[PDB]
Amino acid sequence: SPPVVDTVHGKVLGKFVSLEGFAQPVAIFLGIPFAKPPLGPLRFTPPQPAEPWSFVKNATSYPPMCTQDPKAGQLLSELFTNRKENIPLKLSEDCLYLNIYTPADLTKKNRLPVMVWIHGGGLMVGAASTYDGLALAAHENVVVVTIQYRLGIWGFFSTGDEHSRGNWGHLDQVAALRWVQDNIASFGGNPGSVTIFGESAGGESVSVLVLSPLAKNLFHRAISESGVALTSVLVKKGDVKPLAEQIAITAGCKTTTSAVMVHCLRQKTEEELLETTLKMKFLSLDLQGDPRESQPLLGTVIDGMLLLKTPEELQAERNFHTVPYMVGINKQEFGWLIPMLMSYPLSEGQLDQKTAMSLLWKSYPLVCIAKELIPEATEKYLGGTDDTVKKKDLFLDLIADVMFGVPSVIVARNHRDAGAPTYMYEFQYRPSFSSDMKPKTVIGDHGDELFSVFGAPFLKEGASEEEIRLSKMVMKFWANFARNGNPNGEGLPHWPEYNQKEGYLQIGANTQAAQKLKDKEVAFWTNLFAK
Amino acid sequence: SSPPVVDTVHGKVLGKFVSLEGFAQPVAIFLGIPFAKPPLGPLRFTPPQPAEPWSFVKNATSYPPMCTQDPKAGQLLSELFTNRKENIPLKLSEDCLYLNIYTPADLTKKNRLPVMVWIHGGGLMVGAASTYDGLALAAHENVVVVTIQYRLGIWGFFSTGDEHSRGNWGHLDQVAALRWVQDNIASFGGNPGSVTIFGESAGGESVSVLVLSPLAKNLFHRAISESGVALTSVLVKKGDVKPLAEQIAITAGCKTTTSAVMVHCLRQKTEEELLETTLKMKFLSLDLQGDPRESQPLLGTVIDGMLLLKTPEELQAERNFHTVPYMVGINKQEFGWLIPMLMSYPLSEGQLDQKTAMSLLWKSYPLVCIAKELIPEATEKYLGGTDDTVKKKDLFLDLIADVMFGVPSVIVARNHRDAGAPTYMYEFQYRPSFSSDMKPKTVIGDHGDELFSVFGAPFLKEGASEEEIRLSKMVMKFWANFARNGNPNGEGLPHWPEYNQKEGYLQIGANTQAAQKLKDKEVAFWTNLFAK
Amino acid sequence: SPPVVDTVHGKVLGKFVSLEGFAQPVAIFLGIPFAKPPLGPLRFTPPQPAEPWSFVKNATSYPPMCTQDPKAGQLLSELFTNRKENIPLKLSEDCLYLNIYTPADLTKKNRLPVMVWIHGGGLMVGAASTYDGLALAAHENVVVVTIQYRLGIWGFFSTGDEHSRGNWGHLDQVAALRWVQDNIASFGGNPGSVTIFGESAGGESVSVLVLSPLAKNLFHRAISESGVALTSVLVKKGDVKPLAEQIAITAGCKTTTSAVMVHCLRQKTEEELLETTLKMKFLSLDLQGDPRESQPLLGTVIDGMLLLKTPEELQAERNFHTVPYMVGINKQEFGWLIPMLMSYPLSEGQLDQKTAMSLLWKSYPLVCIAKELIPEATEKYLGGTDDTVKKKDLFLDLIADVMFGVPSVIVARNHRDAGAPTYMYEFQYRPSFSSDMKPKTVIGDHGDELFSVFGAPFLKEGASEEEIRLSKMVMKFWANFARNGNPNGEGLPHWPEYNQKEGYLQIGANTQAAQKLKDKEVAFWTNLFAK
Numbered sequence A, C: 001s002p003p004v005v006d007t008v009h010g011k012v013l014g015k016f017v018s019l020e021g022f023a024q025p026v027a028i029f030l031g032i033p034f035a036k037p038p039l040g041p042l043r044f045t046p047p048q049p050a051e052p053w054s055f056v057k058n059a060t061s062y063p064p065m066c067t068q069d070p071k072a073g074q075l076l077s078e079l080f081t082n083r084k085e086n087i088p089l090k091l092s093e094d095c096l097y098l099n100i101y102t103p104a105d106l107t108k109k110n111r112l113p114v115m116v117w118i119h120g121g122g123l124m125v126g127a128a129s130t131y132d133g134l135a136l137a138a139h140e141n142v143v144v145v146t147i148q149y150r151l152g153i154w155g156f157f158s159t160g161d162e163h164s165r166g167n168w169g170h171l172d173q174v175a176a177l178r179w180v181q182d183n184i185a186s187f188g189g190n191p192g193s194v195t196i197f198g199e200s201a202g203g204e205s206v207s208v209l210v211l212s213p214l215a216k217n218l219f220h221r222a223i224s225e226s227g228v229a230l231t232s233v234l235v236k237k238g239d240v241k242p243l244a245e246q247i248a249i250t251a252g253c254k255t256t257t258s259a260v261m262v263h264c265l266r267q268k269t270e271e272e273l274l275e276t277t278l279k280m281k282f283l284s285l286d287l288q289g290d291p292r293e294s295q296p297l298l299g300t301v302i303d304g305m306l307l308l309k310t311p312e313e314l315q316a317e318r319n320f321h322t323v324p325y326m327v328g329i330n331k332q333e334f335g336w337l338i339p340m341l342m343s344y345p346l347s348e349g350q351l352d353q354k355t356a357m358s359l360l361w362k363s364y365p366l367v368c369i370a371k372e373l374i375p376e377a378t379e380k381y382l383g384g385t386d387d388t389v390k391k392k393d394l395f396l397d398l399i400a401d402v403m404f405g406v407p408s409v410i411v412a413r414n415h416r417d418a419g420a421p422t423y424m425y426e427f428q429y430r431p432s433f434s435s436d437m438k439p440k441t442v443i444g445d446h447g448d449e450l451f452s453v454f455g456a457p458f459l460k461e462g463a464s465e466e467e468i469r470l471s472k473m474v475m476k477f478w479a480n481f482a483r484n485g486n487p488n489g490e491g492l493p494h495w496p497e498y499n500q501k502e503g504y505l506q507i508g509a510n511t512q513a514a515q516k517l518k519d520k521e522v523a524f525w526t527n528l529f530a531k
Numbered sequence B: 001s002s003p004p005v006v007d008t009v010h011g012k013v014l015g016k017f018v019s020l021e022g023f024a025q026p027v028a029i030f031l032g033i034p035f036a037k038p039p040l041g042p043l044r045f046t047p048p049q050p051a052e053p054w055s056f057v058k059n060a061t062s063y064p065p066m067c068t069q070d071p072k073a074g075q076l077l078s079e080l081f082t083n084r085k086e087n088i089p090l091k092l093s094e095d096c097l098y099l100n101i102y103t104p105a106d107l108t109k110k111n112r113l114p115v116m117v118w119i120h121g122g123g124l125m126v127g128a129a130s131t132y133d134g135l136a137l138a139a140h141e142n143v144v145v146v147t148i149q150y151r152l153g154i155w156g157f158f159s160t161g162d163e164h165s166r167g168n169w170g171h172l173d174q175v176a177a178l179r180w181v182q183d184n185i186a187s188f189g190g191n192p193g194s195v196t197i198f199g200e201s202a203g204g205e206s207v208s209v210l211v212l213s214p215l216a217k218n219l220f221h222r223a224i225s226e227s228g229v230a231l232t233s234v235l236v237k238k239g240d241v242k243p244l245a246e247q248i249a250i251t252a253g254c255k256t257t258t259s260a261v262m263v264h265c266l267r268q269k270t271e272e273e274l275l276e277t278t279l280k281m282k283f284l285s286l287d288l289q290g291d292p293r294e295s296q297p298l299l300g301t302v303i304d305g306m307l308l309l310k311t312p313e314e315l316q317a318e319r320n321f322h323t324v325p326y327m328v329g330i331n332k333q334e335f336g337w338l339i340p341m342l343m344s345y346p347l348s349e350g351q352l353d354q355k356t357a358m359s360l361l362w363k364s365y366p367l368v369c370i371a372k373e374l375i376p377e378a379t380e381k382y383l384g385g386t387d388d389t390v391k392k393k394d395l396f397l398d399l400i401a402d403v404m405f406g407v408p409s410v411i412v413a414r415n416h417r418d419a420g421a422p423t424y425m426y427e428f429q430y431r432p433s434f435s436s437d438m439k440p441k442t443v444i445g446d447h448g449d450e451l452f453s454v455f456g457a458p459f460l461k462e463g464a465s466e467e468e469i470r471l472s473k474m475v476m477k478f479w480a481n482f483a484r485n486g487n488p489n490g491e492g493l494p495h496w497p498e499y500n501q502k503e504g505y506l507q508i509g510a511n512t513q514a515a516q517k518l519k520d521k522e523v524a525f526w527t528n529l530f531a532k
C-alpha cells in the first residue's frame, strides 16, 4: 500500500522498495517540488515558494534534469550513477525538484539524521536522479535527499549588478535546504540534524554554503568531496560583465545595458538558450585562442546576497557558522574523467617538458598560472624524471593539486583554525564499476568515492568482497559523521581529527590514519602564487 | 430624455433608454460592463482578477465581444436561441468578461428590485450574453436582469489536473460576476439581498455547480436550472484529465514535459492559434469511427479542490452546502432536434433498427456514458416496445434525453429536497412559433424551447398568437415570483406544487397543470442499470 | 579620489570635474536609475521604484536616451547642447535615468538649492545628457539635475481609458522628483528648495506639473521656457481613441478593444515600435491630407490621474498649490529651428496672402485655427504690407504668437491672478553658437536662451565678452529665483514682478524692464478663437 505523507504544500504519494536483506522497506518519493517553476519572468530571479496543491500528488517518476548539454549530461550520469541501469532523463527549465529516500517507519514519529546530496557537473550539467539513495538509506538508517538546482546560463548568468546578480543555482540549493527544514520531519527526518554533502561542483557548493551567512541554520554538518570554494575554476573573480556580454551577443541580444540583456535573454526560448550554450562550448579545453579568455563554464560570483566578499576574504574573517566539516580528495583527481570530458590532447600517453608547459598555459582557465610561472611549476613537478610517461602523469598530478589538493587543505586548515571540528581524507581505490575506457592504472580518479559512499556494490553487480567491504566502511563513516559530527565509531579504523597535527584518513583497500596531507604542495603553491 | 448615468464601485457608467409597448417607464440598458480584469497574457488560465477602476464616464452602449469560440457554431446557436427579432452578430475576443444589465427601475429613485442573473448555455464551448435581451422580462416583471459572460473552451476549462492549471476558470468567472452584482447592483436599482441565478443547458449545469460550491455560498439566494445539472455527466470530467490536457498541448504545438511547461507554452500561443487548436479538436461533434470511449466532446467542469472539493454525486449526499430554493426543470423532448442537428447525428433517414440503434448508442458514449455491455438492456427497454423503424428512432431520442437531462435533473431535485431545501420542478411542453423551419413539426418541447417564454420572445419577435403570449406571461410571472420569494406561486396562476415527498411537479404548456412523480420509472431503471 | 554617495538604494561612484575659475571641483554622477526599467509588462504603466543594488554602482557613463527617431534626436541634441562636442547617444527603453552636478563639498554637509531640468523635444525626442550642468552648478553654486522620461509611443500612448490612461512620460518626471526628495540631500542639495525648469515640451511639462496634484510638494519653484500647458500642440483634447487605433494598426495590431490593443503593443519589440514611430512621421508638417486629422505628435492627455481637467479649466479653478513661477518666451520662437525641424515649405523666403492662408490651414495641428478664421488672422498680420519677404516673416511671428507668445502670457496672468508670485521675460539675443544654416537676421530663436542659462560660453569656444556676461547674468537671475523665488539680486538689473502692471524683463544685449507683453496679440486672439 502506497505511502502518503503530508507536506506543507499538500500530500505526496511515494512507493515502497526493498533492498535485498532488509525487512524495513524504504519509502521513496520522486520529484517533489520545493519551489515554483522558474519559467518566463521567473528566469534569472531567486526561487520562489511552490504553490500548494489540492489532492494527492503522485511523486513516483523521475523529474527532468535542468537544461544542459544533453550529450555531456547523459554521459556524466552514466559515469557517476550507482544504480544498475542508467535512467534516461528529460531536460527542462521546470527542474526544481528533489528525491527522498527514507528508511523510517512513517506510521511512527522518527527523527533520523538527514543527508542532503548536491550533485556535481561543473554547475553546467548533472542531475539528482543520477544518485539512488536506497542503499545508503537502508544501510545506515538515515534519510537521503537528492536535490537539483538551475545550471549554466539559467543558474549562473550574472551581469554583476542588480539586474541579474547571479548565483541562482546556489539560491536554489538554499531553497531546498529550507524545504527540508520545513518538511523533513514528515518523512521521518530530523530537521535539527541535516548534513549537506556533494562532490566536485557539489563540493564547491557545500563549501560556498558553509561560508554563506544566508545558509547558516539550514545544515549542521558538511562534507565536500573533491571540491571547495577555493577551486578557482568554479568561482568568478573580478568583472563578470564581459562574460555576460559574450553570452548575450551569442544569443543574439543587444548589450546596451544590463537590464536590456536580461530582458532579452528572458524572452529567448529554453531551446534557444540551449543552442547558445552549445555555441559557447563550455567544459572543453580550448586549444587555440588566448587561454586567458576562455570561459570553461559559468559559475559562482560575489552577488552580495549569498556571498558578500570572495571566499578567500570570508575565511580570514573567521565569520561563518562553524559546523563539523569533512573535506576530502582523491589520489588522482585529474587521472582520467576530467581530461577525458574536456578533451585533453593526451592521445600519445606521453609528454615532454616544452609540451607540458604549453599545455599548462592552455589550462590557464583551470589553474590560473601566470605564463611566467609556468617554468617553475612544470620544473617542480616534471623536472625530476626523463620518462615522458611519468612526466604526463606528474603533469596530471600538477593539475589535481592546484584544482583540488591545495585548495581543499587550505580550506580545512582555515575551518580548523576557526575553531570548528574538521576532518580530512584521501580516497585511493579503483571501483570495478569504472568505465571500460578508463586506463586500469588510474586509481582514485575524480568521482571514484561516489561508488562507496552511495553503495554501488549493493545496487550494481560484480563487486568483490573487498569492494563491498570498502563501501560499508565508507557509508558508516559518512553516516556516523551525519549523526555525531565525528566519523568515528565501533569497528572502524580510527580517523584522527584534523587539528594542528593534520592527521587524515587514507581510504582504500588499506585504510589508516596519516599526517600532513599535501603539506609540501601547499607550501610550494602558496609561495609560487605569491610572486 | 437624457441617458442614465450610474456610479459603481469602479467608476461611472453610461447606458441608454429603451421603451417597451405597454410600459411608461423606459428600461435602462447598460451593455458591456467589465466585471473582471481582461484575462490576457499571463492571466490566461488563472482565476479572474478585479477590474481596474476608471475615471470619467465609461460608455456601456455597445454589445461586448463574445469569448473566443467556434465563430460558426456560436453564431448558429445564437440565432436559434436569441429572443430578439434579429440576431445580433458578435466579434470574438479573449477580452470578454463583461455583463449586460437591464433595469426597469427609475434611476432617479431608490429602487431595490429582485435581481436575476442569467448564465447562457452552449456546452461550455460556445455562447454569449448578448444573445439574450432582458428588456421584456425586466419590464414585465419589474426585475433587474443581468446576463453574464465567462471564459469558454480551452480558455475557460483547460485543466492539467494539478496546481499549475486547476481549471474551471469559467466557473470562477461566474462567481466573480456574482460578486460584482453584490457590490454594485444597488446602483442599478437592484436588491443585492435577493439575487437569483438561472441558466439553461451548460448554464443550467453552471447554476447546479454553483449551488454545490462553497465559493459561491452567499452570492445568490435562489437558483434555477433549465435542462442541465451537475449530474449531466457530459459536462463534468471525472477521472484523470491529464491525458486531455496533453492531447490539447500537442495539437497546439507544445511540449508536454510537465504540466507547468504545458501551461507556460499554451499561455504563449495567440488567440488565433488557440482558436485553430479548438477547431482541430472537433469538440461538440460526434465521431463516427474508432473507439467512442476516447472521443472528447468538450472541455468541462472538473474537481479542482477550489470550486468543487468532490464530485457532485458526493456533494449532494453531504447535506453540506448552503441550501436555497432551487427550481429544476426539463423539456418534453430535450434531444428532439436541436442537439442532434448541431452535433451532426447520423439520423438522416428518419429510421432506426435495433442493430443500428445499439451502434449509435455506443458511439454516443461521450454523451450518455453507457458501458457497451449495458447497451442491449437500455436499447431493448426503450426500442423493444415496437417494430416500427421510425418509432424506434423516436424512442431512441427519448433514451438520450432521459440519460442527459431527465433523470439527472430528478436525482438532483430529490437530493436537494432531501437536503431540506425548497425544491420545485417543471416539464415544459410547447413548440414555439419562432422555431427553425428545418425542425420537424412533430417536435414539441425541444431543447431551448422554454427560452422564448422565459425571455418573453412573444414581445420582441413577430407573430405570436395570444396563446403563446399567455404562456410567456405565465412563465415570466412564475420565474419572477420565485425570484422574489423562493416560491413561484402568486395570484393569477395555476398552483405549482412544491417538490416534496409526493414529488409533484408542474407541466407547462398550452394547458398548464400539476402532476406527480416526474420520470419516476426512468430514474428507477437507469439507477438500477448504472448500478451494473 | 572619486566621490561616493550613499543613496537609499545603494552607493554610487562619480567623478570630479574642475571648471576654470573655481577651486572646488564639481562632483558629477551620470546615469543614476530613479525607476525600474519600464520593460515587458511595465510598458505603458506607471514607473516603479528601482531595485536596490549591492556594492558600488559606477555612475560614470552617459545613459541611453529613450527610444526615439535617432536622426531627429541627434539633430536636436546638437542644436541644443551647451558642451563643445556633442555626445552621441545609444537608444533604449531602459532610459529612466538622471544626471547630477553638485558643486558641494560632500565631505561637509550642504543644503544647496536644487534645479531639476526637463528637456524638450516635443515629447518625441531628447535626452538629459545633451545638457551639461557643470557651468551653472559651479557658477551659481546650485545642484543641477537633468532627468529623462519616456517619449513618443512609450511615454504617451493612450487608449483614453483605464487600460492605458497615458502620460507615462509625465509620471516619470514625477518619479524623478520623488527620487530627488528622497536622495538629493546626500548630494549636498536641499530637498526643501527644488526648482523645476525646462524649455518647449519641457516648458509644457513644468506647466503641467504646476497644475497637477500628483506633483504638489515635490518642487518649490517653476520656470517654463517657451512652452506651457496652453501650448495646444502638446495637449490632446477630445477623443484620443482614433490616434491609438491608428498607431495600433500601423504596428499590426487588432483594434477589437482597448485591452487587446495595449496587450498587442506590449508584445512588440523596441525595433517594431520604433519603425511604427518612423512611419507615423511625427514632428513633421503634413502637406497632403486633412490638417484636422494630421497628428504631429503623441502628447499630454487628460488622464484623470495627472490632470483631472483640461489646463484651461484648472487655471481659472484657482485650485493648485501656488509656487513662484517664471514664464518666458523668445523674440522669434518660430524663427528658424522649428520650421526647419518640421520641414516647412518656406523654400522661397517669400509668401503671398493666398499661400499664407494655405499654410496657416495646413499648420492646423500647431495653431488650431479653423479654416474660416484663417483670413481674419492672415489679414491681421500679413495685411500690413505687400512685400512678400516681409509677409513671410510676419507669418512666422503669427505662428509664434499662437504657439508660445499668447499661451505664455495667459498662463502667467492666471498664475498671477491666483495670488502666486509671477515673473515673465522675453529673450532677444542671437547666440554665436547658432547653426550656420540659420539666417543671420533671426534673433531670439527657439532655444536661444539655453546657451545663456546653461553657461555654454564657459564650455564652448569663441564667446565674446558680451555673450559671457549675458550668460553670467542669466544664471544668477535663474539661481536667485531658485534660492529665493525672486530673480533679483545685487548687481543685476531690476526684474519687476508680473503683477497687474504686467511688467517683464527684456533680456539681450540691453537688459531692461518693460510692460504688457503680447497684450495686443492676446486681445486679438482671445477674441478670434471665441468665434
Ligand SMILES: OC[C@H]1O[C@@](CO)(O[C@H]2O[C@H](CO)[C@@H](O)[C@H](O)[C@H]2O)[C@@H](O)[C@@H]1O
Pocket (backbone or CB within 6 Å): A334, A335, A336, A337, A339, A340, A344, A346, A347, A348, A349, A350, A392, A396, A437, A439
Ligand atoms: O584518450 C585517448 C587515449 O589516450 C591515452 C594514451 O594513449 O590516455 C591519455 O588520455 C587520458 C584522458 O583522455 C588520460 O587519463 C591518460 O592518463 C592519458 O595517458 C589512452 O589511455 C586513451 O585511450
Ligand SMILES: OC[C@H]1O[C@@](CO)(O[C@H]2O[C@H](CO)[C@@H](O)[C@H](O)[C@H]2O)[C@@H](O)[C@@H]1O
Pocket (backbone or CB within 6 Å): B336, B337, B338, B340, B341, B345, B347, B348, B349, B350, B351, B393, B438, B439, B440
Ligand atoms: O431538415 C430536417 C430533417 O431531418 C430529418 C432526417 O434527417 O430528421 C432526423 O434528424 C433530425 C435532427 O437532425 C431529428 O430531430 C429527427 O428526429 C430525425 O428523424 C427529417 O425528419 C427532418 O425533416
Ligand SMILES: OC[C@H]1O[C@@](CO)(O[C@H]2O[C@H](CO)[C@@H](O)[C@H](O)[C@H]2O)[C@@H](O)[C@@H]1O
Pocket (backbone or CB within 6 Å): C335, C336, C337, C339, C340, C344, C346, C347, C348, C349, C350, C392, C437, C439
Ligand atoms: O532650408 C530652406 C531655406 O529657405 C530659406 C530661403 O531660401 O529661408 C526660409 O526657410 C527657413 C526654414 O528652413 C525659414 O527659417 C526662413 O525664415 C525662411 O526665410 C533659407 O534661409 C533656408 O536655407
Ligand SMILES: CC(=O)N[C@H]1[C@H]([C@H](O)[C@H](O)CO)O[C@@](O)(C(=O)O)C[C@@H]1O
Pocket (backbone or CB within 6 Å): A030, A031, A032, A033, A057, A058, A059, A060, A061, A062, A063, A064, B162, B257, B258, B259
Ligand atoms: C507528467 C509527468 O511526467 N509528471 C509526473 C507528475 C509530477 O511531475 C511528479 O512530481 C513527478 O515528477 O506526477 C504524476 O504522477 C501525477 O502527479 O499524477 C504524473 C507524472 O508522473
Ligand SMILES: CC(=O)N[C@H]1[C@H]([C@H](O)[C@H](O)CO)O[C@@](O)(C(=O)O)C[C@@H]1O
Pocket (backbone or CB within 6 Å): B031, B032, B033, B034, B057, B058, B059, B060, B061, B062, B063, B064, C161, C256, C257, C258
Ligand atoms: C467609454 C468606454 O470606455 N466604453 C467603450 C466600450 C467599452 O469597451 C465597454 O466596456 C463595452 O461597451 O467599447 C468601445 O470602446 C468600443 O470599441 O465600442 C466604445 C466605448 O467608448
Ligand SMILES: CC(=O)N[C@H]1[C@H]([C@H](O)[C@H](O)CO)O[C@@](O)(C(=O)O)C[C@@H]1O
Pocket (backbone or CB within 6 Å): A161, A256, A257, A258, C030, C031, C032, C056, C057, C058, C059, C060, C061, C062, C063, C064, C097
Ligand atoms: C555597462 C556599462 O558600461 N554601463 C554602465 C552602467 C550605467 O549605470 C548605465 O548603463 C549608463 O549610465 O552601469 C554602471 O553604472 C554600474 O552599474 O556599474 C557602470 C557601467 O559601466
Ligand SMILES: *[C@@H]1O[C@H](CO)[C@@H](O)[C@H](O)[C@H]1NC(C)=O
Pocket (backbone or CB within 6 Å): A058, B240, B242
Ligand atoms: C497517480 O496515481 C493514480 C492512482 O495510483 C493514477 O490514477 C494516476 O493516473 C497517476 N498519475 C498519472 C500517471 O497520471
Ligand SMILES: *[C@@H]1O[C@H](CO)[C@@H](O)[C@H](O)[C@H]1NC(C)=O
Pocket (backbone or CB within 6 Å): B003, B058, B059, B061
Ligand atoms: C458613447 O460614449 C461616448 C464616450 O466616448 C459618449 O460621448 C457618447 O455619448 C456615447 N454614445 C451616445 C451618443 O450616447
Ligand SMILES: *[C@@H]1O[C@H](CO)[C@@H](O)[C@H](O)[C@H]1NC(C)=O
Pocket (backbone or CB within 6 Å): A239, A241, C013, C056, C057, C058
Ligand atoms: C566601477 O568601479 C570601478 C571604479 O571606477 C570601475 O573601474 C569599474 O569599471 C566600475 N564597475 C564595473 C562596471 O566594473
Ligand SMILES: *[P@@](C)(=O)O[C@H](C)C(C)(C)C
Pocket (backbone or CB within 6 Å): A120, A121, A122, A123, A199, A200, A201, A202, A233, A234, A283, A338
Ligand atoms: P566537477 C566534475 O563537477 O567539475 C569539474 C571539477 C570541472 C573541471 C570544473 C569540469
Ligand SMILES: *[P@@](C)(=O)O[C@H](C)C(C)(C)C
Pocket (backbone or CB within 6 Å): B121, B122, B123, B124, B200, B201, B202, B203, B228, B234, B235, B284, B339, B447
Ligand atoms: P447545452 C445546449 O449548452 O450543451 C449541451 C448540453 C451539450 C450536449 C453539452 C452540447
Ligand SMILES: *[P@@](C)(=O)O[C@H](C)C(C)(C)C
Pocket (backbone or CB within 6 Å): C120, C121, C122, C123, C199, C200, C201, C202, C233, C283, C338
Ligand atoms: P519643443 C522644441 O520640445 O517642440 C516644439 C514646441 C514642437 C513645435 C512641438 C516641435
